[PDB]
């Protein structure tokens, strides 16, 4: 089906404690495949998925060069932003950056992105036409005008429609066993007594990939949206994901409740019942 590749960059200034901390990670879909950490001993871009390890020293040398250059621009950006927002030398601040591309289920270019946040808040983003910029702040306007005059969006359009999706497709092919797989959720229910008159019914989905999933409870086929406790999908640590959804079931009423699981790895959606 559909796929994406994304790179995430965080830079955090540390006044009086040296250079800003910089961390870059890259993902294809929900699978991390590279990392750089400016505090770490190696100073190299490093593999985080087995399928990227057989790329070759030209790859590792080049990506280490490019990632270090990203670290350096963010190091300038922090000083630049502090100037724009008239902020003191003393505080720690955060620049985040994300870019990358989606392909549709034909594997052709679908959507491109490139956006920045400052201190947890949208700063500037490339619009979907990849030709113009969204900026909310007055300070961000200085950036927008700089980028318009330097034709950064033209440069980014070229990369997102060409190189970005070409390398996504290469990775999809090279990592076919890991990236073009699905792991269907292995499911179960638990039942714990709150008190004498009700019990919590929890529907579990475990070891699934990719992360996208819908877990819902119905009672006589009516959706129980407002009475369902739902936790955030969470990583198992081994490349799979986990989720649960729970409802409070009054005594004798277990039979009215169904849990509904939708996931790409399932041959049909599951309807589960405590029985």
């Amino acid at each position: 089906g559909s796929h994406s590749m994304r790179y995430f960059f965080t830079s955090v200034s540390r006044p009086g404690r040296g250079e800003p901390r910089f961390i870059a990670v890259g993902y294809v879909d929900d699978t991390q495949f590279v990392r750089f950490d400016s505090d770490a001993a190696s100073q190299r871009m490093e593999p985080r998925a087995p399928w990227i390890e057989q790329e070759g020293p030209e790859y590792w040398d080049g990506e280490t060069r490019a990632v270090k250059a990203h670290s350096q621009t963010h190091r300038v950006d922090l000083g630049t932003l502090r100037g724009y927002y008239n902020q003191s030398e003393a505080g720690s601040h955060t620049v985040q950056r994300m870019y990358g591309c989606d392909v549709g289920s034909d594997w052709r270019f679908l959507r491109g992105y490139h956006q920045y946040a400052y201190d947890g808040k949208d700063y500037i983003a490339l619009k979907e036409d990849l030709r113009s910029w969204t900026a909310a702040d007055m300070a961000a306007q200085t950036t927008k005008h700089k980028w318009e005059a330097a034709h950064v969006a033209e440069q980014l359009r070229a990369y997102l429609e060409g190189t970005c999706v070409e390398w996504l497709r290469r990775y999809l092919e090279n990592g076919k066993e890991t990236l073009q797989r699905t792991d269907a959720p292995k499911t179960h229910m638990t039942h714990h007594a709150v008190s004498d008159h009700e019990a919590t019914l929890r529907c579990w989905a475990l070891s699934f990939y990719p992360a996208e999933i819908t877990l819902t409870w119905q009672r006589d086929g009516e959706d129980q949206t407002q009475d369902t406790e739902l936790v955030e999908t969470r990583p198992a640590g081994d490349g799979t994901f986990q989720k649960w959804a729970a409802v409070v079931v009054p005594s004798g009423q277990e039979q009215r409740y169904t849990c509904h699981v939708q996931h790409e790895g399932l041959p049909k959606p599951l309807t589960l019942r405590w029985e």
């Binding site: 490019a66 300038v76 950006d77 870019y99 700089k146 990369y159 190189t163």
Partner: peptide
Amino acid sequence: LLFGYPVYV
């Protein structure tokens, strides 16, 4: 593969 050109805010 990373974007190869410098961008400064």
